[PDB]
Subunit: 322 residues, 2 copies
């Protein structure tokens, strides 16, 4: 009956989301973005397997050898005092604390704090960060500090995936693009969001041609070479056009560049389009493993086209019911 702990399997949890009994946007979408970045970085660039459980409200038995916990903590020195962020890495094999950070976030220092956490995690996990990871991080985060809060907000809206959330993400990204023309990645993320929005509410012919021209210009930009986002755009554009082989090629390259819940959802959608439901279900279960919860389920059920969890993904249907 014994379940063996795996020291290279890590869960990320969030505790006390309601610092002031209420939420609470700002520190929270930042923390959600940090959690996603840590999970994606380790999944892509190390032999750790990370389950981002930030969006997962259930506690179940798991073989995770380590747990990274993000908690908001109030010093209670006066009413309505801002919480600080506590981040702890615990080894579940013996209960020891490997990393214990207290972070005060200041609407400006988000990248510096994140960098400190990444440096400390590298030391605690005996895990140097490879060159491609360091280069990628330089390209996928805004360096104008004033824009960070809204960038993290757009990210959280993307995770939610519904039409209203994507509409707001596109708006936020459009503002960032205007404010920071050099931050090419934001232009690419906005095109990805916009193609998905087109699948939700189809553009007229003129607007579609404009979006397609924008995609064409983006995917050839040399500074976005070697980023998963270009391949996500190529994959979603091909899915929309029903070009199955082109989408399959794109998303597998995207996955090499970024092991993320979203890339596995997109691979699932390609497999469904190919008439391969078992392979689709396997990709969707992978996505759910990487980031379990309502956000990933929303994308599985609704992203690009509708997918029946009972029919296409019966293991997950049964799991969710159990």
């Amino acid at each position: 009956s014994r379940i063996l702990l795996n020291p290279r399997d890590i869960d990320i949890n969030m505790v006390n989301k309601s610092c002031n009994s209420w939420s609470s946007p700002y520190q929270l979408s930042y923390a959600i973005g940090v959690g996603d970045l840590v999970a994606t970085s380790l999944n892509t660039f190390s032999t750790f397997m990370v389950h981002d459980k930030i969006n997962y409200n259930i506690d179940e038995p798991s073989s995770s050898g380590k747990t990274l916990s993000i908690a908001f903590v109030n010093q209670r020195q006066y009413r309505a005092q801002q919480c600080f962020m506590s981040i702890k890495l615990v080894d579940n094999a013996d209960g020891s604390t490997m990393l214990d950070k207290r972070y005060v976030i200041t609407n400006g220092n988000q990248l510096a704090i994140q960098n400190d956490l990444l440096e400390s995690l590298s030391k605690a996990l005996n895990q140097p960060w490879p060159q491609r990871m360091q280069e990628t991080l330089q390209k996928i985060l805004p360096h104008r500090g004033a824009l960070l809060t809204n960038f993290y907000q757009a990210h959280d809206y993307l995770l939610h995936g519904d039409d209203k959330s994507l509409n707001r993400a596109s708006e936020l990204l459009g503002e960032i693009v205007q404010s920071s023309p050099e931050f090419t990645y934001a232009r690419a993320e906005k095109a990805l969001v916009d193609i998905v929005r087109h699948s939700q509410h189809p553009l007229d012919e003129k607007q579609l041609a404009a979006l397609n021209t924008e995609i064409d210009n983006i995917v050839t930009l040399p500074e976005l070479n070697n980023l998963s986002i270009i391949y996500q755009i190529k994959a979603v554009s091909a899915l929309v056009k029903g070009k199955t082989d082109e989408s399959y090629q794109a998303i597998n390259t995207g996955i090499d560049l970024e092991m993320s819940w979203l890339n596995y959802v997109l691979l699932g959608k390609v497999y469904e389009m190919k008439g391969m439901n078992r392979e689709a279900a396997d990709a969707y279960l992978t996505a759910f493993n990487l980031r379990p919860g309502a956000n990933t389920l929303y994308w599985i059920e609704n992203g690009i086209f509708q997918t029946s969890v009972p029919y296409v993904v019966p293991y997950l249907d049964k799991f969710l019911a159990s």
Copy 2:
């Protein structure tokens, strides 16, 4: 209470080791070597996590989404007819068979069969093999077919790890080296075995100087560049000399090149030498995850120097008792 299956966690099992109710060397050490190669290849070169349970006699609950089963099957067309090897990959999420092979092994075709299995696994798992993996496989296996059976036998003796087994491995490798001077890897594996044998039964001054000269010549050979074995030799040689920093540097490079149970045992031994028992226990638990059973436990408890599982690795002590 639900445990979520992870589609990127794979166990490898062996069924019907006693083809003729008795063992049974030949097909068995080949199958053990194939299992180890598959696990190490996927662990090193993909985002799959593989648990090689070939040496593990217990069935426990696990989150493994897929199981690769090696089984010996007798056609029973006449008494004492040789078994063939059945290899099946099963998806535990739905019970579907992903790969189903029937292999007749002929004292010659071991590499060809293994290549077929690796090609088929690449297709079944949507997992292309990277260039470094293809190059490595060309260097770590003998290409003189007549030597394969004994090479796999030496490998199994290495896994066992006790003094008599290593003595026999060294002998077998010495014969291979004489028969195949070009197969430089065998010379490196023999030096690794021989340094470990020296930790078991120390060589006199003259013989130690000869071994150290041999190590010096081996580690500079350009064709063994980019192979974990050179770093394993460097790490074990430094451990024997009590050079902790040199050993730590070597084994971490070795791990980058090969995610294997043996490299994590060696990292554990370095951490113990550094006075870092918690980090050692974590490395040892990693090794046990990669290849659970008596062989890995033997190396944890006895490799290079003696290690108390109750004191140094209490989680594993308790697990084994539970």
